[PDB]
Design a binder for this molecule. Sequence first.
Ligand SMILES: O=C1O[C@H](CO)[C@@H](O)[C@H](O)[C@H]1O
Length: 475
Amino acid sequence: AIHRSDFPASFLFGTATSSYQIEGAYLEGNKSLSNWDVFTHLPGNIKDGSNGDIADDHYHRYEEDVELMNSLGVNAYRFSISWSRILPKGRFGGVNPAGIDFYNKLIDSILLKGIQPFVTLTHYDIPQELEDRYGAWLNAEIQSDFGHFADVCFGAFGDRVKYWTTFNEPNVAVRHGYMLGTYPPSRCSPPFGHCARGGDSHAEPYVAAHNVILSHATAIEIYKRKYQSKQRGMIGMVLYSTWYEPLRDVPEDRLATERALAFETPWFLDPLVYGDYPPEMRQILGGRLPSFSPEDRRKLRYKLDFIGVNHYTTLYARDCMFSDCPQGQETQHALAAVTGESNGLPIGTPTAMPTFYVVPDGIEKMVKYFMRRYNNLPMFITENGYAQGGDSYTDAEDWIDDEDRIEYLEGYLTKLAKVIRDGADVRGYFAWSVVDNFEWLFGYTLRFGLYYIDYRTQERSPKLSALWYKEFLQN
Ligand SMILES: O=C1O[C@H](CO)[C@@H](O)[C@H](O)[C@H]1O
């Protein structure tokens, strides 16, 4: 149904990964322990009790993985840099040459094949030491650490990397980390949970996000002042971008839907484009959102060059401002509740990932939302994809037969081509993921890969979707 020629000639087509999810070699090459290294070695977090110690062993097997990408005919590869490999002890601890060597080699390998790097600086991970020293995202000192990390990466890799992302989905990592307490540093308060470390779900998430925003701003000021004229790259931020529809087509649910949307990606994007938090958020939260100082605002004038759209699913949103809803959900402060069902019918075909339904026109609608809110600022679809999991899969053959993933990709790509024809400045698409990998709290129980991985042997095998994507990219 959909073909390569239905997109612009210079469109990026790739796959996406992150460092913790694929690399393994978690203590090799002088790398320090990350937050997720520490987290996954505690009980009661990961569904299958697994960790990222080995994962896909991409640290040793990167060249095979680059060859697999190449055989699909991708022209780009989205990956993240492990902060703990570059600056194991943060900014006063010295640059780790072994980390620099690993990423240089990876970048050179993909460029040899004509595959453009599309690099995420941080994707959920930090050196544990930054948490231990000053509480990471709860202290403004993180801005300087992140600034320095960014500066090192730009200086070492930026001659060959033309697309950078500061953060992957800080909307998810912050709320999970500081509101629900389900991600490290596992902080929360009632009614979201009882976290033994402590926390304040009504305050700390907004402090953390504040420092993420300003870490971005510090990094992009560094890039534009120091590196941009020589390196000629673009610096963006990636946000988790779910589309929301009103549960009932009435004003209170429409308004609730607008709130749900505004509390997600504009939480970060409004400050980065307009220099203030979303007014939808400010109206409800007031002083819980910290202020931007004159110094902050100076950095915020560098803004961002693109929006990284991680879009998977679409949900219904309903009002909680004038109805009493269950408390302790991540949408609590937005005074909306979200669901995938209306009247015993799901919004689209359910999948093995909770909240992920097959709703292709969500990607069109999400892109148009960005277009209108941010005056068609350039966008990249930095993640889109489909999970297999559960009882139905006992052997390799079951995982390889992924006509369901093919149908997802075809539907979403069809709607993406449509929104671009309709004027959206979308410039690429990255399928999550090239390989099955460690799916955070789900461990290895969810498989998003175009390639199946046997974790006993590390054997890579193409699923039908790998063959499909190859055929699509051949036109
Ligand atoms: O949005 C995402 O979706 C992926 C699937 O849940 C996950 O693996 C990535 O790390 C995350 O960036």
